[PDB]
């Protein structure tokens, strides 16, 4: 399927992913497309922050899903 991720700067990135794709796989795709390391990526869907070790289907991510990427530190 295809998903769209909007960054805190408003940039929209399209990803060809699958429901069975792991969070690590999508983070690796985002790193390849933008250079953001997977540990630094903070993805939120439906108010739930994506975490490593799980899959998109674990977050009920479906066709044409919209995600929010917040590349931010703390402090």
């Amino acid at each position: 399927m295809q998903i769209f991720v909007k960054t805190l700067t408003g940039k929209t990135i399209t990803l060809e992913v699958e429901s069975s794709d792991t969070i690590d796989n999508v983070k690796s795709k985002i790193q390849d497309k933008e250079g953001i390391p997977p540990d630094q990526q903070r993805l939120i869907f439906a108010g739930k922050q994506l975490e490593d070790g799980r899959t998109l289907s674990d977050y009920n991510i479906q066709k044409e899903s919209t995600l929010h990427l917040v590349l931010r530190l703390r402090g």
């Binding site: 805190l8 931010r72 530190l73 703390r74 402090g75």
Partner: protein
């Protein structure tokens, strides 16, 4: 732009409050607000109440407000004076943000403290060394001060 906006924010808070965090002007001064925050139940601050002072600058909403604590807390990101270094209140601020989002962000931060920004280095070191002792100290401080 600096008074109609504040009146609108107060009216909105008076319609659908989050039922936990409250905010209101101190007497009659729309640029000085008091806020009450309930301790989250999933963090060792459970059962505690906290007080905040909010100052709205004259450049509101183009410039973020200034928030300070009033009751002490064993938190890495809350110094003795209560000053908070938060990204929303200094860096990631846009005119669309209301004053309820700041309170929600603070009530969320009271559950996920950041040790990497050790505003009190002793507390962050205790967090990074002994989590159980860290949470025990946090609960002791909440029992001592919050009520």
């Amino acid at each position: 732009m600096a008074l109609k906006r504040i009146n609108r924010e107060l009216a909105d808070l008076g319609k659908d409050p989050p039922s936990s965090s409250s905010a209101g002007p101190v007497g009659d001064d729309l640029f000085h607000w008091q806020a009450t925050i309930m301790g989250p139940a999933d963090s060792p601050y459970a059962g505690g109440v906290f007080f905040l002072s909010i100052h709205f600058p004259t450049d509101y909403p183009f410039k973020p407000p200034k928030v300070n604590f009033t009751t002490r807390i064993y938190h890495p990101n809350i110094n003795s004076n209560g000053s908070i270094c938060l990204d929303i209140l200094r860096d990631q601020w846009s005119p669309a943000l209301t004053i309820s989002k700041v309170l929600l962000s603070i009530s969320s931060l009271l559950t996920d403290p950041n040790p990497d920004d050790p505003l009190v280095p002793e507390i962050a070191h205790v967090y990074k060394t002994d989590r159980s002792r860290y949470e025990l100290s946090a609960r002791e401080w909440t029992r001592k001060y919050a009520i």
